[PDB]
Amino acid sequence: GASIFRCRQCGQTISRRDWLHVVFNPFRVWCFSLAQGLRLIGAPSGEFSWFYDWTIALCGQCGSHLGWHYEQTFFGLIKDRLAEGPA
Template sequence: MNKHLTLFTTSPPISLTWDEAPDEPIKAPKPIFDNPSLASTDRMVCAQCGDDITRSSQRIAVNGSHRHAVPTAHGIDQEIGCFSLAPGCLSMGHFALDFGQPTEGFWQMAVCAGCGNHLGWHHQTDDAFGFYGLILDHLAAAPDDAKKEAA
């Protein structure tokens, strides 16, 4: 099977072409990223800058589950967690319909208010129900506060 990839974001564009032998076994898809440290933490911070993003008490279930796999155009699955509030996030950009129909609501990009790192998306419906779908690998468990260590 002949495959081709062109990267237009470079100047000049880079083009790669390769053949995959059809007799090679098909590799199993990469498992969903897993961030087990978030399961037992209360505060969740931006993995890039360490600013507070949300708390475990803000976890919610959407369509029956807190965690969801979201495939990307690059063939990588991202695991998102749903949160009712994420005070450390800024919702930005124009509303986009990337994930569904207009009747299902609208999505905006959610970034860290401290460093601008892409953390996920904010979903808003016409009836004012909103939630954040945050990429779990872009979050980290907050380190223990210095005050707790001193106590």
Template sequence: MYLNKPPLPCSFLKSTPPGPNSGIEVKGETELEEFNEKAITCRECGFEVTNNSFSTNVKNSHEHAFFNPHGYVFQIRCFSAATGCVTLGKPSAEFTWFAGYTWQIATCSKCKTHLGWHFQSSSNSFYGLIKDKINEG
């Protein structure tokens, strides 16, 4: 809303890529595709459980640190899918790290090592994989 005078017009500057001496590195599409295709593997057996293209942010972060009721601290990384994982047990809301989500244990489908948890709500799901149990790219 304005009184008597209309708002001033805006002009936009066209963005140009930084020059070679700018100190800014610009990644090309090929490098981004290569990063996204990098496998995330089970540290125990090397089986591919997911890849970087499934990295996702939950509560505005890809990585979280939590502790369980026994005091063990876990650093987890979040992925929207982990086709190389199998979930075990019935979904539980007990001591969930993400309000509104239930969880199940997620293991490597090849060697059965505990890799993290599958979290599920009425509208979303994701895997929280333990940083120390996976190899990235």
């Protein structure tokens, strides 16, 4: 019962197990090769990248900030902004 990852606020499907780092801001971050249901916003930036340039990733449904897209490319999503459950 922890194989699909959804937005904590609204329950939008974001990523999978399947597609699967503790960091400090200037978070428990989960790295995914693929994701869905996001909206990537703004221009890429390298400022204090934990890894790659980053772009902000919002929930495409409710607009909640769920993490970043890195760009070969991958997603770094904030564990505490996600809800885990079954497929």
